[PDB]
Amino acid sequence: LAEEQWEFEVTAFYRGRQVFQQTLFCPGGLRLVGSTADMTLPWQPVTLPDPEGFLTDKLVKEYVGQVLKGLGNGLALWQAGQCLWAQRLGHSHAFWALGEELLPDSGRGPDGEVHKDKDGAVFDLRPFVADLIAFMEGSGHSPRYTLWFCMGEMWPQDQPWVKRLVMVKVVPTCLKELLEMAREGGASSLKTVDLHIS
Template identity: 60%
Template sequence: MATPKPRILPWLKAALDQERFPGVAWLDSSRTRFRIPWKHGLRQDAQQEDFGIFLAWAEVSGAYTPGDKPDLPTCKRNFRAALNRKEGLRVAQDLSKDPQDPHKIYEFVTSGVGDSPGLDSNPDTQEVLESLNDMHLAPHEYRGPPGLEATTVSTCPLFVMPLSDTRVSSANCEPSDTPVIPPWLPEDAWDFQVTVFYRGRQVFQHTALCPWGLRLVGPDGGDPTLPGLPFILPDPSESLVDQAVKNYVTRVLQSLGGGLSLWRDKQWLCARRLGHCHTYWALGEEHLPPTHGSEGEVPKEHGRSIFDLRDFVEGLIAFINGNQISPRFTLWFCLGELWPKDQPWTKKLVMVKVIPTCLQNLLEIARQGGASSLNTVELQISGGQSLSLNSEQLVASLENLLDSMEY
């Protein structure tokens, strides 16, 4: 007969009383506050014993068999997810980034140390939370633009479908015919919305799923053998009247060559230009590029990181917790000219805006939830059902995602 899975709170209380793990200890005589070491696995001084309590819970809960190679980050995420599902327990202080003694302080907010049914009694909420807690950045092979060494691009299973848009049809990008939009969809890649402006006038906008990244190319389509879904910038003669402006825009597009390449490498978005067209980039707002200047020029010799998902997730957590500044995720590119600093961006010949739509929709979910844990987000799940996910649960899931990322 199989041994029943223990309940985490009585198990944890016993571990605290017996001082079973180094650094795991009660902090008051009433036994309502306790600390747990919380060292990031990528720190140079991280040792397996720093994950002792996480590995022990994985073993007693049946998620780990002694003798197997332990997946320590997963053990840590599952442990935290189990605690986060207990309504009578909260994180009183998060000191996990303390350089000398990274740890978290938990506090029981109800009398006794029992297992409250809490979220465990709601299977729909549990299903969504488990899918969020399983978010990771698992690598898969990616060839990358020519001239780059073979690298890996990892998938982010957190993926929110755009509410409405025109999608590009291709062999590598198929539109969804599902009329009901579920909030969390595990996918192997991101959707990107690309918007193109000629002298401030919008001339192109499409959204597509890009498993191997994307390339911004001229009307000739560029080299079809290169990796990345091509977004073909339109012929300026179809939208511009001024002949001189048309000529200049045409020259910019012709110099794109193989295109401007954008792809994912683990938690980063990277860019590289494959032609002669000098390109400058910056993170900006959804509707306006920044006026302070570019973050730099997109290199030709090698790819460079231009966006870190970790920064976005940290900013999103701060926003949910009350910070008035929402994280930025919109990439702006100025093609063929210097960045429009101290002048209207609408005067530039070619400006391109790229939005990872999963991040756009995730921010919208956070806005719906507000900055209070009392607020909830109504989510549509499969079968037409709905459930409420409060801000604390969303933050806990985002923190799990952070644990899978690098610094």
């Protein structure tokens, strides 16, 4: 089986509303599903909540449920060979990109599309380590670690991400901690500032 998996903080947003946030350590991999799936190891199912208890817009509630239905066997996430991988096992397409912890980038397109096969890499540790080293040298650019997934719809280019039906945020805790260690050592990303004081 798999080994040396990473702990992830998974957060889900239904129409710009946070409905799920859990710190998951799944050593046999995890699958983000839309309904109550049977407990299977490997690939632990992680059930996203029913939008009935979090939303009141009927049309949004029906279409979010349509996206959750399209998850099927779920969005598989696993670590293998210094890299992170994502595979959609259902009918709903998924687009991914790196971004901030509270804001995916809407000015650019997605870094790629989630592969239906098993060769869909969504993160590589080599550029993260190289950017983290340069960040500690005074580059002003911190390495990105937050993985955003847009489920069922196109990536929100030039459109408020809070309008998307299902947005999932995946944060590897080991990478975030490594960036907090660099910031604790004296590094910074605050290159530009313009305070208005009178």
